[PDB]
Amino acid sequence: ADVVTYENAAGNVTFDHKAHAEKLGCDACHEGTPAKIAIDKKSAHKDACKTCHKSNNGPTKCGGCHIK
């Protein structure tokens, strides 16, 4: 799987299916069985993606995940 890119009115968000994985190892987003995790404007803001970002030397503010 390759760079998907979610295009949204608040800024596109770069779903790096490859580029994150190349460092992460799939596992990081996927407990053994990878599958289509539902992402939305709660999920992506509470814990999915966020909580890794919270506990990583990476961006966390809106305009550090959304393009602007």
Ligand code: HEC
């Ligand atoms: C966390 C940021 C991810 C990384 C890195 C990988 N995947 Fe992923 N995957 C992620 C999400 C949020 C989703 C949902 C995509 C959507 O818009 O629905 C997925 C989905 C998959 C799927 C399911 C595809 C389907 O059958 O509908 C697969 C098979 C999958 N991801 C595989 C996969 C592998 C092998 C990864 C390492 C190369 C990998 N993902 C990384 C989130 C993330």
Ligand code: HEC
């Ligand atoms: C990545 C680490 C994110 C951070 C930080 C923020 N957002 Fe986000 N947002 C993210 C994703 C993966 C998505 C998926 C698309 C969807 O519609 O849910 C979103 C989406 C939004 C949207 C919806 C835009 C639309 O066209 O309706 C909004 C309004 C939004 N995000 C706002 C938002 C704000 C204000 C943030 C800082 C508090 C913010 N997001 C951070 C991923 C990420």
Ligand code: HEC
């Ligand atoms: C850890 C398990 C992560 C998950 C889950 C997600 N991301 Fe991530 N992201 C992570 C790291 C360690 C980094 C690199 C930080 C650095 O500065 O080296 C990132 C980076 C991003 C970026 C920045 C690149 C860009 O396109 O500008 C974005 C936008 C980003 N991450 C988005 C993102 C989204 C939307 C996620 C799920 C839908 C997501 N990340 C998950 C670590 C992890």
